[PDB]
Amino acid sequence: MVGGVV
Amino acid sequence: MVGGVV
Amino acid sequence: MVGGVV
Amino acid sequence: MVGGVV
Amino acid sequence: MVGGVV
Amino acid sequence: MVGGVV
Amino acid sequence: MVGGVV
Amino acid sequence: MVGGVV
């Protein structure tokens, strides 16, 4: 489970 | 960039 | 949002 | 197994 | 096993 | 926020 | 950059 | 379990 913002 | 993996 | 069940 | 991304 | 990211 | 149970 | 891993 | 902001 991975979530991100760049 | 926005993203998610379950 | 990211969610999971196993 | 149940999962989601929103 | 249950998990989340918000 | 990040949370999990195992 | 913002991110989380469960 | 890891969460961060840069």
Torsion of CA F3, H2, C3, A1, to 10 degrees: -150
- Resolution value (Å, 1 decimal): 2.0
CB-CB under 8 Å, F2 with H2: yes
Chains D and H share 3 or more Cβ pairs within 8 Å? no
CB-CB under 8 Å, C5 with D3: yes
Within 8 A by CB and 6+ apart from D4, the residues are B6, C1, C2, C3, C4
Tell me H5's DSSP state. E
Within 8 A by CB and 6+ apart from A1, the residues are B5, B6, C2, C3, C4, E3, E4, E5, F4, G5, G6
The technique is X-ray
Chains B and C share 3 or more Cβ pairs within 8 Å? yes
